[PDB]
Ligand binder design. Structure first.
Ligand code: UI5
Ligand code: UHU
Ligand code: ZN
Ligand code: ZN
Lengths: 771, 776
């Protein structure tokens, strides 16, 4: 049939490696969560009495119920991988509690969003008030319920719960009823609010049941404004919130898989193609070396990574989790597209890069804790979640990440096995009566062995992946380019057979994709990093506060971080492998400033924890050293000085900064000009500024040619002091700097913008509070 | 300072090669033109008495003066390359005649457009009536005068005429005065009419004079509706006339070069970036293997090359000429963008591909004659211009093309020479006291030798381009292996104290590749190294292969061959690729020794370089099929494609409303009319009326009009003012909603001309008409 299939997690057992460690640490974190707290939002909205308070953080500020969704997925997948009894009891319990909630309402509805029944009543009637991250005064409710749809799906598919299947079908039938009276225009209006991968889950329900009404529902939930450009090979992603988009694209691809033999619809190949193009543009133009994307959750321009190297909010972990889910889908049928009937190993090159360097790095391996933002800025650190405090999106996906490292190691195609990832594992290839063990100390050693533990004397082809970054193969003791490919080995495999091969690894120096003067060291597919200090690791284990996912500690000026001096080729050659069982390197070349520790020590980024770090280093030629150092010593130092005086910061029109500052508005809009986001209002808009130290100054950014004006109120007191207008920057933005008449005291403070004798407010692009 | 510079044409002498042949053939064609005929439009509009009638064709049907513009450029550049005295005398004469015209009016105006003074008076006052290809009833006058601006610039920069400089400044100052009373809105409205690269030329005048007012004028003449998407990495080019857009983008890039140190404007990198993105999208998504783009002069969708493989109007030559000018600009500062101080050789990969396969193929090498359209349809031919008859845009650019093959062979950067094209040449590198000779029989042999003929004992780096499609070199007998640095295109540095008598030998390994049509339909062309190969498929019905002066004589109107009669490659692409084998002899020649249908009874299919294939029908792209799918593919081609060919071979005349050249060729008139696109097809309609003259070479029985089915607006049809009242036979609607109305005429239209006029039939608009076809 040529169909490539994936193994279930039951049939791929992880052996001793960093991936098994990560699985076991995640198991401990999953088991630390209290199911009564995660179920509490659901019971409340069903009119039942909760057994415990919900979690705080996002679980009581509008996204109540989203972690419960992920919890079902993570439980279900971890159960499939491990067979853990404690997990089993938790999953059974959680499913039954949500079942009680579903019975109490009796329509199929399950949800945690505060005032859910009121919300979905409004929507069914055609009262749809959508913003980018809001629907009828609620925080991304469609995104929220998607995690339940996905959770119940996963409980059926991975854990074999018939109860979950029935719960999922009732919940999907419920949404058919909610949307039965809405036009396509109304649907697409509603889908302007972030809605996760609802279209994926509804396509999943179509495959599970075999009923095309769910496939009709999936297409109605496919957001057209994103899809239509991607069909025509157009990247319009600049300025967009990135994690919003990737689950839609997963969705479009899934609709195409499940619609492959629908006679009444002929748009499958188009939707498939659109997803392939999306993957192409994000991976090859918008991704850093660790495999992630986005800055402050948003796609910056692909010709300008300045913000990637300057902002502490580097790639979000959810985005990579989702990019890997998309990768898995695209690889599966990649042979059908090019008509080779052979899947494309370049998808695996990316899978490996992102899994080893971003997913594996995003969990603290001993204590546990999940990362939201991984700064690519040289010399900052990343913040970890804690079980009871942190209810972020990146916790949710974090719980899922480490359950399923077995999922992409192999793939099967009739009589053919693809050996894709070099991860110690035992495979049960039941369809050919084969058991197989892969052993390797990779990435700390080059050798891989594949032992046939059991076989039924049938002719089978092992397709061994030969990566870009890597041909002698020893079969049964018998000894026997430059492109992602596969080496076929066909034998009547019997018990005791042994395939030995080596993966040659080299140092590369990989430039930031827009070709600015920044480079990271890699060894094979492993991103290396240096530890730059352990000072001011503020909130490294997060509390439950809004914005506790961000690394808010002191910003170090870039001139204090090691800068690589010379030509890239000699820089690359000056990194030297140290001896020992683990990957470790020293950079022994020209550096600025002087290194007191003699030389720079680099290790795999996935092992660098509880520390500030550089992955990308600033580079400078000897010719350009003077002017580069002047820029870093003056302009960059002052920008760091500004950040270290900053007490609070809001980016209007960016959903999480606004959500974190308790955005309220009346008759308001958001948008983009010159790659910066803004909000404005005909009515008003407001935030709560959170003030850890006393503040002397407020600093508002507008465009100079915007002739609309704004009154500013601070706790209802009108600010009448005249701003110090700065010179307009290249793109037409000016800062208004207001010396406040009294200091804002430690605590909270409302800032409100309403129009000053014009229709709109000024479009505000930044709100910053300074000492 | 690590800036890359180009050599002047005076310092790069072409040696014996196909490029020198092409230069010398173009010289003969340039000298065949009568300067009194080319100057006649200019003298007329100045109120002077011409010494001869203007040329016919486009020189008396609205674009009068456009070839005179190009003539100045071609003369100037050919003078620089050759030092030919006859060229010098022609240029001097032409400049003086246009100077007399400029003096007679005395405002700075020089132009050939009929009623020029009246036109520019209207425009200065703010009476602007712009269409896509018209301004105040005149055919692309801004495009026309651009050729004069460019011609005078070239006479200064290449030939060192101070008179041309002064004429250029007066003409630019004249346009400052014309546009001094117009708002930005009015400018941008006027720029909806095709205007060539006026913004480029005005930026050129800014650099020549050093006065920023010309740079301000250049930005005012930059069309924003095209620029603004390109700044944001958005390709919206589908449906657009392609040669209209590329000179604007050249313009935007040139404004960025000349604005590099302007403190009062900070948009240079944006405009530079927009041009780089444009180059990227056209080359990597919209270009065929010969390096060209467009079908019927327009950008089709990049996921659908069906029209590229069906239509006799393949890539236009002007587009590649212009793409190569943009390439040269982008390569020059490419090292500054990535801050490597090393220019990007992938620009050269394209330059080579387009130069060898499109530009070099577009001139008949012995007789002369320039090509307008190069069909990628399997089994058609291309039409050549003739000196006295053909005044097309592609003649104008054609005259320029072959003057300047010396321009991109090398580049220099202080102590570094880039050896980019493998073209026999003698280089005068005055800046390092070096004379150098490149000798090679490439593409017919792999060996290149570089001889140092003169040097001043300085350490200098020769950067030898190593193309994608291609490491042992030899300096003075001694062989020197270096590591194969990458599969990708790169430069090999060789640094010595070069002295007289030194010799660098290297080889360029060439392989057969099989390049698929970019949308991945089952069509492939053979290449050997960067050379596109082709097979000759016959010499039947080469109608108008040397064009007369008629409207539409640029198109290859001969009988279309059914695709089933053309060789189809049978088997998997890998085996197809391996089955092409090099024949012996000094010249590139191949036989395809694999499976072909229809079958070859006598000899294998013979493939040669497309640039040597002339006076013949050809295939570059072949249809491909597996052995499993062979039967059903042949059955499909024997019905549907055959019938489409049968229709075309019955066709006596054809018009595509809303496409500028078909309409212009059929004498478009209208009142209260609009054009536009639906489902990738162009249309015109009117509240007043619109009309054409149908040209009828043989007697015609039938008229066939295409509309959308759901358009409820209707049209009366008049043929020479007699109303056509016969009922059309309505065809079934195709997939995109289009129906053909087929009218059996009551009498045959006789051989000659005939007006067709559409006015509304009891509705506000006419029906939107997408095709008008006259059949026997
Ligand atoms: C040919 C010619 N008609 C010119 C002006 O309209 C166009 O640019 C080219 O396509
Ligand atoms: O809005 C819900 C999620 C979003 O997908 C991600 O970027 C983070 N903001 C949360
Ligand atoms: Zn997240
Ligand atoms: Zn042309």
């Amino acid at each position: 049939n040529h169909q490539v299939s994936y193994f279930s997690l039951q049939d791929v057992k992880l052996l001793s490696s960093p991936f098994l460690q990560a699985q076991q640490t995640d198991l401990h974190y999953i088991l630390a969560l209290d199911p009564d707290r995660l179920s509490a939002p659901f019971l409340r909205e069903a009119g039942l009495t909760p057994k415990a308070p919900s979690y705080t953080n996002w679980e009581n500020t509008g996204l109540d119920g989203h972690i419960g969704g992920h919890y079902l997925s993570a439980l279900s997948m971890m159960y499939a991988a491990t067979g853990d009894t404690a997990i089993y009891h938790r999953l059974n319990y959680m499913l039954n509690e949500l079942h009680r909630a579903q019975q109490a309402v009796g329509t199929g509805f399950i949800g945690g969003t505060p005032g859910s029944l009121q919300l979905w009543k409004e929507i069914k009637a055609g009262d749809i008030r959508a913003g980018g991250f809001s629907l009828n005064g609620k925080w991304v409710p469609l995104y929220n319920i998607h995690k339940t749809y996905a959770g119940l799906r996963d409980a059926y598919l991975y854990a074999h719960s018939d109860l979950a299947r029935q719960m999922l079908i009732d919940l999907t039938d419920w949404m058919i009823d909610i949307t039965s009276g809405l036009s396509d225009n109304q649907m697409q209006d509603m889908l302007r609010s972030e809605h996760g991968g609802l279209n994926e889950t509804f396509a999943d329900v179509a495959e599970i049941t075999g009923d095309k009404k769910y496939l009709k529902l999936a297409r109605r939930f496919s957001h057209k404004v994103i899809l239509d450009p991607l069909i025509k090979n157009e990247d319009r992603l600049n300025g967009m919130h990135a994690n919003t988009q990737i689950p839609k694209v997963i969705g479009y691809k899934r609709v195409a898989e499940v619609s492959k033999n629908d006679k009444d619809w002929n748009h499958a190949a188009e939707w498939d193609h659109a997803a392939r193009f999306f993957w192409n543009t994000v991976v090859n133009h918008r991704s850093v070396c660790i495999g992630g994307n986005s800055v402050r959750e948003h796609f910056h321009p692909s010709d300008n990574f300045t913000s990637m190297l300057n902002d502490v909010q580097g790639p979000e972990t959810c985005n990579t989790y989702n990019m890997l889910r998309l990768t898995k889908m695209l690889y599966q049928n990649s042979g059908d597209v090019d008509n080779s009937n052979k899947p494309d190993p370049r998808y695996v090159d990316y899978y490996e890069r992102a899994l080893y360097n971003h997913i594996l790095s995003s969990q603290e391996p001993d204590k546990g804790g999940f990362v939201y933002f991984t700064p690519m800025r040289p010399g900052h650190y990343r913040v970890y979640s804690q079980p009871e405090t942190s209810m972020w999106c990146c916790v949710g996906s974090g719980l899922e990440n480490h359950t399923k490292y077995g999922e992409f190691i192999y793939a099967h195609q009739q009589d053919t096995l693809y050996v894709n990832l070099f991860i110690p594992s035992q495979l049960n290839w039941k369809e050919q009566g084969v058991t197989l063990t892969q052993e390797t100390l990779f990435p700390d050693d080059e050798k891989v062995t594949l032992r046939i533990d059991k076989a039924a004397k049938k002719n089978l082809t092992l397709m061994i992946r030969i990566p870009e970054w890597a041909y002698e193969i020893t079969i049964n003791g018998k000894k026997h380019t430059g492109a992602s490919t596969y080496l076929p080995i066909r034998r009547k495999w019997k018990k005791g057979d042994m395939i030995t091969f080596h993966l040659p690894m080299k140092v590369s120096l990989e430039q930031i994709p827009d070709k600015k003067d920044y480079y990271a060291f890699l060894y094979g597919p492993i991103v290396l990093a240096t530890s730059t200090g352990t000072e001011n690791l503020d909130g490294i284990y997060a509390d439950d506060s809004r914005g506790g996912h961000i690394a808010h500690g002191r910003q170090t000026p870039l001139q204090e971080i090691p800068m690589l001096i010379g030509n890239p080729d000699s820089i690359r050659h000056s990194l030297h492998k140290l001896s020992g069982s683990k990957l470790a390197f020293s950079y022994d070349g020209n550096v600025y400033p002087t290194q007191k520790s003699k030389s720079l020590e680099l290790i795999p980024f996935f092992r660098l924890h509880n520390s500030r770090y550089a992955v990308y280093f600033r580079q400078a030629s000897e010719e350009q050293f003077k002017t580069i150092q002047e820029e870093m010593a003056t302009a960059e130092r002052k920008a760091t000085e500004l950040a270290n005086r900053t007490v609070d910061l809001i980016f209007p029109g960016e959903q999480q900064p606004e959500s974190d500052h308790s955005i309220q508005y009346e008759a308001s809009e958001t948008g983009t000009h010159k790659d910066r986001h803004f909000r404005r209002a005909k009515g008003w808009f407001s935030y709560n500024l959170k003030i850890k130290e006393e503040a002397s100054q407020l600093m508002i950014t507008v465009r100079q040619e915007d002739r609309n004006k704004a009154v500013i109120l601070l706790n209802n007191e009108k600010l009448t002091v005249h701003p110090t207008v700065s010179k307009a920057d290249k793109d037409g933005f000016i800062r208004l700097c207001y010396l406040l008449p009294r200091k804002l005291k430690v605590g909270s403070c409302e800032i409100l913008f309403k129009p000053d004798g014009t229709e709109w407010t000024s479009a505000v692009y930044e709100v910053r509070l300074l000492k």
